[PDB]
């Protein structure tokens, strides 16, 4: 009743067991459910090390970030996602005037979104 | 009744067990549920080390950040996500005037969003 | 009852077992469910190391980022995703005026989206 048994010589390292025992039941909801994810797979082991017996992002770029265990819920309803502007104009001159309109805004720059966001703008 | 048994020689390291015992039942809600996530997978072991017997983000960039165990809920309803402006103009001169309009705003820059956000703007 | 048994010589390294025991039941919902994912596969082992017995993204580019264990739900309904602008104009001069209209906005640049986002704009 174990994961490893050791008789010979040598010191030891990562040996794991892990359980995650999950039992649903009956639910019985009347209507609708939306936004429902069901996933079961986790095993990522980039490098084991070893037994004995130059990274550069130049413009705007990121380096060495790693996120886990993060949930973002913003489902909502009847939503507008994006850029919007509702400038409203008319000219209608009468006399010795001269009607011109430009309604400039102004430049922007130097933003970046890294990681786990949702809406990034 | 164990995870490892050790008889030979050597000192030991990470050996783990972990349980996460979860039992639902009956729920019986009438209506709707939205924004519902169901995931069960965790195992990430970047590097084990070893047994014995130059990172640079230049412009705007980030370095060495790692987040876990974080939840953000802002679902809401009837929402507008994005940039908005409602300048409103008209010209209608009569005489010896001259009607011009520009309504500039002003530049912006030097913002960045890193990690786990939701709405980043 | 184990994963490895060791009698000869040598120190040890990663040996794992992991469980993920999941039991559904009856659900019985009346209506609709949308956005439903069911996946079960996890095993990624980039490099084991070894037993003994120059990366550059130049323009706008990223470097060495890795995300896991992240869920984003923003399903919603009746939504507009993209750029929008509702400038509204008319000219109708009468006299000695002269009706011109330009409604410029302003340039933008230097944004980038990296990782796991959802809506990136």
Author numbering:
A (entry chain B), B (entry chain A), C (entry chain C): 3 to 55, 86 to 153
Publication excerpt:
The functional human SOD1 is a 32-kDa homo-dimeric metalloenzyme; each subunit consists of 153 amino acids and contains one copper ion and one zinc ion. The misfolding of human Cu, Zn-superoxide dismutase (SOD1) in motor neuron cells plays a crucial role in the etiology of the disease. Instead, it has been proposed that immature forms of SOD1, which lack copper and zinc ions and the disulfide bond in the structure, are the origin for cytotoxic misfolded conformations. Substantial experiments have demonstrated that the full-length apo SOD1 can convert into amyloid fibrils by incubation with reducing agents in vitro.
We produced amyloid fibrils from recombinant, full-length apo human SOD1 (residues 1 to 153) overexpressed in Escherichia coli, by incubating the purified apoprotein in 20 mM tris-HCl buffer (pH 7.4) containing 5 mM TCEP and shaking at 37 °C for 40–48 h. The cryo-EM micrographs, two-dimensional (2D) class average images, and atomic force microscopy (AFM) images show that the SOD1 fibril is composed of a single protofilament with a left-handed helical twist. The SOD1 subunit within the protofilament stacks along the fibril axis with a helical rise of 4.82 Å and a twist of −1.187°. We unambiguously built a structure model of SOD1 fibril comprising the N-terminal segment (residues 3 to 55) and the C-terminal segment (residues 86 to 153) at 2.95 Å. The density of an intrinsic disordered segment comprising residues 56 to 85 is invisible due to high flexibility, which is reminiscent of the internal disordered segments observed in the structures of patient-derived amyloid fibrils from systemic AL amyloidosis. The SOD1 fibril core features a very compact fold containing thirteen β-strands (β1 to β13) and an in-register intramolecular β-strand architecture. Three pairs of intramolecular salt bridges formed by Lys36 and Asp109, His43 and Asp101, and His46 and Glu100 (with distances <4 Å) are identified to stabilize the intramolecular L-shaped interface between the N- and C-terminal parts of SOD1 fibril. Two pairs of amino acids (Val14 and Asn53; and Gln15 and Phe50) from the N-terminal segment and two pairs of amino acids (Gly130 and Asp125; and Arg143 and Gln153) from the C-terminal segment form four hydrogen bonds to stabilize the fibril core. In our SOD1 fibril model, Cys57, Cys111, and Cys146 are all in disulfide-reduced conformations with free thiol groups, and misfolded and aggregated SOD1 evolves from a pool of immature SOD1. Once apo SOD1 dimer converts into its fibrillar form, the SOD1 molecule undergoes a completely conformational rearrangement, with the antiparallel β-barrel of apo SOD1 converted to β1–β5, β7, β8, β11, and β13, the loop between β4’ and α1 converted to β6, α1 and the loop between α1 and β5’ converted to the internal disordered segment, the loop between β6’ and β7’ converted to β9 and β10, and α2 of apo SOD1 converted to β12 in the SOD1 fibril.
